[PDB]
Design an enzyme around this catalytic site. Structure first.
Site, PDB file in Angstrom:
ATOM      1  N   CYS A  69       1.408  -7.093  -3.577  1.00 32.96           N
ATOM      2  CA  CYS A  69       2.489  -6.639  -2.657  1.00 32.96           C
ATOM      3  C   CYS A  69       3.645  -7.614  -2.423  1.00 32.96           C
ATOM      4  O   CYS A  69       4.807  -7.220  -2.499  1.00 32.96           O
ATOM      5  CB  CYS A  69       1.933  -6.186  -1.322  1.00 32.96           C
ATOM      6  N   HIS A 106      -0.073  -6.938   4.297  1.00 38.69           N
ATOM      7  CA  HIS A 106       0.840  -6.225   3.414  1.00 38.69           C
ATOM      8  C   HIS A 106       2.296  -6.514   3.772  1.00 38.69           C
ATOM      9  O   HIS A 106       2.618  -6.813   4.930  1.00 38.69           O
ATOM     10  CB  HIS A 106       0.554  -4.712   3.480  1.00 38.69           C
ATOM     11  N   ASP A 121       9.100   0.166  -0.111  1.00 34.60           N
ATOM     12  CA  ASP A 121       7.829  -0.480  -0.403  1.00 34.60           C
ATOM     13  C   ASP A 121       7.461  -0.142  -1.817  1.00 34.60           C
ATOM     14  O   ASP A 121       6.954   0.961  -2.072  1.00 34.60           O
ATOM     15  CB  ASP A 121       6.765   0.019   0.565  1.00 34.60           C
TER      16      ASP A 121
HETATM   17  C1  LIG Z   1      -7.134  -0.599  -5.436  1.00 35.09           C
HETATM   18  C2  LIG Z   1      -6.516   0.797  -5.455  1.00 35.09           C
HETATM   19  C3  LIG Z   1      -5.282   0.826  -6.367  1.00 35.09           C
HETATM   20  C4  LIG Z   1      -7.551   1.808  -5.980  1.00 35.09           C
HETATM   21  O1  LIG Z   1      -7.048   3.145  -5.897  1.00 35.09           O
HETATM   22  P1  LIG Z   1      -7.859   4.425  -6.484  1.00 35.09           P
HETATM   23  O2  LIG Z   1      -8.213   4.119  -7.925  1.00 35.09           O
HETATM   24  O3  LIG Z   1      -7.100   5.704  -6.213  1.00 35.09           O
HETATM   25  O4  LIG Z   1      -9.248   4.373  -5.665  1.00 35.09           O
HETATM   26  P2  LIG Z   1      -9.475   4.402  -4.068  1.00 35.09           P
HETATM   27  O5  LIG Z   1     -10.955   4.220  -3.881  1.00 35.09           O
HETATM   28  O6  LIG Z   1      -8.543   3.457  -3.363  1.00 35.09           O
HETATM   29  O7  LIG Z   1      -9.156   5.920  -3.608  1.00 35.09           O
HETATM   30  C5  LIG Z   1      -9.889   6.547  -2.536  1.00 35.09           C
HETATM   31  C6  LIG Z   1     -10.005   8.059  -2.726  1.00 35.09           C
HETATM   32  O8  LIG Z   1      -8.699   8.607  -2.546  1.00 35.09           O
HETATM   33  C7  LIG Z   1      -8.282   9.270  -3.737  1.00 35.09           C
HETATM   34  N1  LIG Z   1      -6.885   9.026  -4.131  1.00 35.09           N
HETATM   35  C8  LIG Z   1      -6.291   7.822  -4.263  1.00 35.09           C
HETATM   36  N2  LIG Z   1      -5.014   7.981  -4.683  1.00 35.09           N
HETATM   37  C9  LIG Z   1      -4.771   9.293  -4.836  1.00 35.09           C
HETATM   38  C10 LIG Z   1      -3.624  10.136  -5.248  1.00 35.09           C
HETATM   39  N3  LIG Z   1      -2.446   9.576  -5.601  1.00 35.09           N
HETATM   40  N4  LIG Z   1      -3.817  11.487  -5.278  1.00 35.09           N
HETATM   41  C11 LIG Z   1      -4.995  12.064  -4.935  1.00 35.09           C
HETATM   42  N5  LIG Z   1      -6.071  11.347  -4.540  1.00 35.09           N
HETATM   43  C12 LIG Z   1      -6.023   9.987  -4.474  1.00 35.09           C
HETATM   44  C13 LIG Z   1      -9.174   8.729  -4.850  1.00 35.09           C
HETATM   45  O9  LIG Z   1      -9.321   9.665  -5.922  1.00 35.09           O
HETATM   46  C14 LIG Z   1     -10.465   8.469  -4.124  1.00 35.09           C
HETATM   47  O10 LIG Z   1     -11.176   9.707  -4.146  1.00 35.09           O
HETATM   48  P3  LIG Z   1     -12.745   9.888  -3.811  1.00 35.09           P
HETATM   49  O11 LIG Z   1     -12.747   9.949  -2.292  1.00 35.09           O
HETATM   50  O12 LIG Z   1     -13.090  11.184  -4.527  1.00 35.09           O
HETATM   51  O13 LIG Z   1     -13.426   8.680  -4.405  1.00 35.09           O
HETATM   52  C15 LIG Z   1      -6.126   1.221  -4.025  1.00 35.09           C
HETATM   53  O14 LIG Z   1      -7.319   1.208  -3.215  1.00 35.09           O
HETATM   54  C16 LIG Z   1      -5.047   0.376  -3.373  1.00 35.09           C
HETATM   55  O15 LIG Z   1      -3.863   0.469  -3.742  1.00 35.09           O
HETATM   56  N6  LIG Z   1      -5.467  -0.380  -2.341  1.00 35.09           N
HETATM   57  C17 LIG Z   1      -4.598  -1.126  -1.429  1.00 35.09           C
HETATM   58  C18 LIG Z   1      -4.209  -2.513  -1.927  1.00 35.09           C
HETATM   59  C19 LIG Z   1      -3.561  -3.331  -0.818  1.00 35.09           C
HETATM   60  O16 LIG Z   1      -4.221  -3.704   0.139  1.00 35.09           O
HETATM   61  N7  LIG Z   1      -2.273  -3.637  -0.965  1.00 35.09           N
HETATM   62  C20 LIG Z   1      -1.542  -4.453  -0.009  1.00 35.09           C
HETATM   63  C21 LIG Z   1      -1.922  -5.935  -0.037  1.00 35.09           C
HETATM   64  S1  LIG Z   1      -1.244  -6.705  -1.534  1.00 35.09           S
END
Ligand SMILES: CC(C)(COP(=O)(O)OP(=O)(O)OC[C@H]1O[C@@H](n2cnc3c(N)ncnc32)[C@H](O)[C@@H]1OP(=O)(O)O)[C@@H](O)C(=O)NCCC(=O)NCCS
Length: 268
Positions: A69, A106, A121
């Protein structure tokens, strides 16, 4: 040494007008998160993450890598300032996947356009915004990807995305200004604290025109815009590195050390 705007815009593939318009803000906000991935390769490999301009643009712009971020939004802020925008730094507590009160881990931005406040963002991760949003509480706002809204909760705001028919909170923020030195303290913690999961897991994301790619450990998710989510389990360290380098366009400086750590820590 100054910010190299030409090189930055070439890195994100922006060939449009150079001005401080909303149209330009929208175009940059769409392009940046598609061109530059979100990833934690350096923290994962124990390499320092530098936020100073010279290091930041060497890594991402000249070096063609990504970041997380602070790297994304500092870079974006430098570009917006060079284009003439009025832009300030903000911080936020992450709610997505999170105990009662989380750290301000963040970074986001505020942009003032003709007296109106927008947030921008390009650095959250899986759900990085692909358009700026008007700081207008309650309202659903369409973007080139998912719908978002900002809701007002006492002193603060929550940024929410519409996911699987629910409003899901990404993070909460107030309008307290933040400067590079503030981000450097938080960055030191996220990138080096043994508690921090940015050190222990592999996490990545990249936006595309009709979809988002997101990766957490050994699970790749492809979120098709207004469609299905394809999920893949990644069986090996080698296939994890293949997926990052091939599909996600992520650079791994030392693939051997990367794969070695993946095998060590039972990520796959
Ligand atoms: C690490 C990361 C990229 C992983 O994302 P992901 O691969 O989609 O996986 P997540 O476990 O986070 O998603 C949780 C759920 O929401 C869903 N989801 C996430 N993004 C989605 C989208 N764009 N559309 C539909 N569903 C979504 C996922 O499919 C998952 O589904 P489930 O409940 O069936 O498992 C994400 O968690 C992230 O961006 N985290 C935040 C990072 C952060 O803290 N940034 C700021 C500090 S630098």
């Amino acid at each position: 040494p100054p910010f190299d705007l030409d090189a930055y815009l070439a890195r994100i593939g922006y060939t449009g007008p150079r001005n401080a318009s909303l149209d330009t803000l929208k175009a940059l906000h769409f392009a940046h998160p598609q061109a530059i991935p979100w990833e934690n390769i350096d923290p994962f490999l124990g390499r320092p993450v530098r936020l100073d301009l010279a290091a930041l643009q060497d890594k991402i712009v000249l070096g063609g890598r990504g970041g997380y971020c602070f790297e994304h939004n500092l870079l974006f802020m430098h570009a917006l300032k060079a284009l003439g925008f009025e832009v300030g730094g903000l911080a936020a507590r992450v709610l997505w996947g999170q105990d009662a009160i989380t750290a301000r881990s963040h970074m986001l931005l505020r942009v003032e356009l003709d007296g109106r406040t927008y947030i921008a963002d390009v650095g959250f991760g899986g759900l990085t915004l692909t358009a700026p949003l008007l700081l207008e509480p309650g309202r659903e706002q369409k973007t080139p990807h998912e719908p978002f809204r900002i809701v007002e909760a006492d002193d603060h705001f929550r940024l929410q995305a519409a996911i699987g028919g629910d409003w899901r909170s990404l993070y909460r923020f107030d309008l307290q200004p933040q400067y590079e030195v503030d981000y450097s303290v938080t960055n030191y913690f996220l990138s080096t604290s043994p508690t921090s999961h940015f050190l222990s897991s592999v996490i990545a994301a990249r936006a595309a025109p009709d979809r988002r790619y997101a990766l957490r450990g050994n699970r790749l998710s492809i979120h098709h815009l207004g469609g299905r989510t394809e999920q893949t389990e990644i069986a090996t360290a080698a296939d994890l590195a293949d997926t990052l380098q091939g599909l996600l366009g992520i650079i791994i400086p030392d693939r051997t050390a990367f794969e070695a750590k993946v095998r060590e820590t039972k990520i796959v």
